[PDB]
């Protein structure tokens, strides 16, 4: 007991010493020689209306045109973002959904929430109506995030401090990822879908291996609950948004926090974090009813998106980086270009 | 006009979906949303009987459809999902009176702490909290043998059911820091009482009238 605790403390001290030794420089002082991105002026191009309650999640399609969103009224609406047309409207058994995912193929969608159940709905049914394809159960906490990894299996994170890779065909937990001491609130799958970072309420994020099932890395430095997480487009780094008004960019290779994005004028939490196509801009939704676009390489706030009258709960960027869709608690979605 | 036949038909489908969603929202607007809270086995199951992570119970009483959501067994960070219940019409907070003399720290102390946290948080700054004091018969039975001084050392009253119940209700209501905007409805029940649904009906009727006044630009 005491000896094991001392050994764990020594291992943590060794980790900190190695991180300090490998930190010969900092990203802020390295990217001082590159020109700033200037002022990002994004004007809302599309405004999606039809949700009767606070929108809690959205997910872009791989075609950069379809957009799924979930609301607390019990509705999962799939939009044609180009024409603002409601492609689909799925009534959900539980109205307490706080996450939703869009399959890379587009044939399926996912949702989950306080029901501790991940519902996967088939969009390409021969009957022409979107019926629930699978009902994954086994999580003892609220489903906070879910991300599709191909059609057959899906990665989810729950409020019982655990993540799970489920095989949709069999409905059983293929892999269980445990070790977070707080409720996992966000997920992000790597572009190759071999690793994924999950941030929890323990003020920490964990890089997990899908195939191995073991915790590859652990990242610390946030002062409060991490609500958002997102990989860099390169896949060698990720960004986390937490309850304290600061985003943090960590690098997997360096196992360290590269950058901190914070302003004294912001004292509100962060609900969503996403990157642009090139990763130069980091877009974070805040509780001040506004989104902030920071220069990820220079930590300078490039611009502000101030079209939402309520808390910006969910945010996403298309696969081609053409537009950014932000859904807020005002029951509206806004697509900016 | 700039739209093809398939595009126009898709627009028509979107309009039909809009109409269906508007009808669903109108139907759900008149429903009475209730959030059931408690410190444990205080009587939430007993209240649900006479009226996974989230348990939804829908029942119709006097032409009002109540949807009561029970969050018992969630066992996770409560602060991470209370904001989902911001629009809930009323909160039924159940407290076991007989748990005054029991301990896990006193059980009633934990119940009072939970009541203070729920009532005084930002998401329920104006949501009405109807309070149920279950196991009143057990409380009356064990109040003569177990004085309230164990739970409330400041109780200067006698070992009488009426005085002790009034003191406990006053102590629970004193935790409200927004008495001007939030009203706490206190009711006493023992087992399978048919007046619980009537009391909830009256409380939610008052809440609905106040909300209609607020939504009409009149309050």
């Amino acid at each position, epitope marked *: 007991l005491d000896q094991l605790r001392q050994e764990a403390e020594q291992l943590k001290n060794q980790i900190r010493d190695a991180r300090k030794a490998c930190a010969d420089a900092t990203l802020s002082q390295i990217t001082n020689n590159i020109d700033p991105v200037g002022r990002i002026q994004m004007r809302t191009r599309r405004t999606l209306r039809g949700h009767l309650a606070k929108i809690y999640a959205m997910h872009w399609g791989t075609d950069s045109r*379809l957009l799924v969103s979930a609301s607390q009224d019990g509705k999962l609406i799939i939009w*044609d973002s180009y024409t603002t047309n409601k*492609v689909h409207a799925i009534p959900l058994r539980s109205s307490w959904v706080m996450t939703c995912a869009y399959a890379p193929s587009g044939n399926y969608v996912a949702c989950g929430g306080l029901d501790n159940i991940c519902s996967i709905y088939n969009l390409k049914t*021969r*009957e*022409g109506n979107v019926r629930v394809s699978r009902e994954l159960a086994g999580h003892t906490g609220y489903l906070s995030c879910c991300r599709f990894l191909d059609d057959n299996q899906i990665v989810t994170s729950s409020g019982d401090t655990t993540c799970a890779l489920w095989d949709i065909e069999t409905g059983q937990q293929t892999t269980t990822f445990t070790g977070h001491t707080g409720d996992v609130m966000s997920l992000s799958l790597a572009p190759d879908t071999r690793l994924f970072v999950s941030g929890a309420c323990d003020a920490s994020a964990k890089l997990w291996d899908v195939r191995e099932g073991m915790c590859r890395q652990t990242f610390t430095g946030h002062e409060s609950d991490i609500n958002a997480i997102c990989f860099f487009p390169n896949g060698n780094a990720f960004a986390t948004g937490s309850d304290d008004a600061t985003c943090r960019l960590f690098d997997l290779r360096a196992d360290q926090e590269l950058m901190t994005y914070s302003h004294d004028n912001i004292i509100c939490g962060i609900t969503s974090v996403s990157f642009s196509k090139s990763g130069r801009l980091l877009l974070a939704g805040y509780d001040d009813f506004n989104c902030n676009v920071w220069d990820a390489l220079k930590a300078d706030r490039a611009g502000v998106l101030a079209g939402h009258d309520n808390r910006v709960s969910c945010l996403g960027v298309t696969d081609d980086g053409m537009a950014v869709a932000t859904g807020s608690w005002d029951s509206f979605l806004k697509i900016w270009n | 006009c700039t739209l*093809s036949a398939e595009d126009k*038909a898709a627009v028509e489908r979107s*309009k039909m979906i809009d109409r269906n969603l508007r009808e669903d929202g109108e139907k759900a607007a008149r429903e009475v949303k209730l959030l059931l809270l408690g410190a444990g086995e205080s009587g939430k199951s007993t209240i649900v009987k006479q009226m996974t992570g989230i348990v939804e119970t829908h029942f119709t009483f006097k032409d009002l459809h109540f949807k009561m959501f029970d969050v018992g067994g969630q066992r996770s960070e409560r602060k991470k999902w209370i904001h989902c219940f911001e629009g809930v019409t009323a909160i039924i907070f159940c407290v076991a009176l007989s748990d005054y003399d029991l301990v896990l720290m006193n059980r009633m102390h934990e119940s009072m702490k939970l009541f203070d946290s729920i009532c005084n948080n930002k998401w329920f700054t104006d949501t009405s909290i109807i309070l149920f004091l279950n196991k009143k018969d057990l409380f009356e039975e064990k109040i003569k043998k177990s004085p309230l001084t164990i739970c409330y050392p400041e109780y200067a009253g006698s070992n009488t059911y009426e005085e002790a119940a009034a003191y406990i209700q006053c102590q629970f209501e004193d935790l409200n820091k927004r008495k001007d905007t939030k009203e706490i409805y206190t009711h006493f029940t023992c087992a399978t009482d048919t007046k619980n649904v009537q009391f909830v009906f009256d409380a939610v009727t008052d809440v609905i009238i106040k909300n209609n006044l607020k939504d009409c630009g009149l309050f």
Partner: single-chain antibody
Amino acid sequence: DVQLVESGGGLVQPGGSRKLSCSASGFAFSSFGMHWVRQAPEKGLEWVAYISSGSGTIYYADTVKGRFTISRDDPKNTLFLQMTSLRSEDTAMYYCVRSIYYYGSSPFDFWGQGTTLTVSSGSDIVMTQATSSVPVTPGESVSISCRSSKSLLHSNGNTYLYWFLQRPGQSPQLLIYRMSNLASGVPDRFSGSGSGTAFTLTISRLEAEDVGVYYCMQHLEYPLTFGAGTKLEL
């Protein structure tokens, strides 16, 4: 699973009235648009009418407008076509065609069995088939060419061309929708290409299961017109 069973056909004297019915099963009939399509004993180029989901929009062919009427009953999942003052040109087989409309949808995917009705004794875009009978051999590649009076490509980047295959004794089935997309259940042997006006359907490794008449249809304009029908022999 999905089924559209037609009834009400037979022999009708000229000038009479007949109500064809199409009972739907295995799918959500309420959310699906329904077309009535006419296959003449020789031509099969005629599209009768169309009703949208919820009966919001109803369209008729120029030959049948003011004479035929198309209605739907969602609770019983039925499609009705009432025809008054029937003419000798209406002697044909009628099909009720399932057709949903959203982004990425597959309209005209399923066709009904059809009922035979026999009557006793200019601005519309036209689609033309480059050939009528094509002698083919199994295992080879066959190209079916079609032409259009007006470009089928729209300002949204969608070319609204549909390739259907009708087997002998079977209702037409959707092979290609929007000139490039394979319908569900259709083998990958079929491919579609075009440049807005001229289109080609290519079949690789032909078998005996895809021998029949190939029809091309446009959906750019509300009056839906079909091609003459390229028939494959042997």
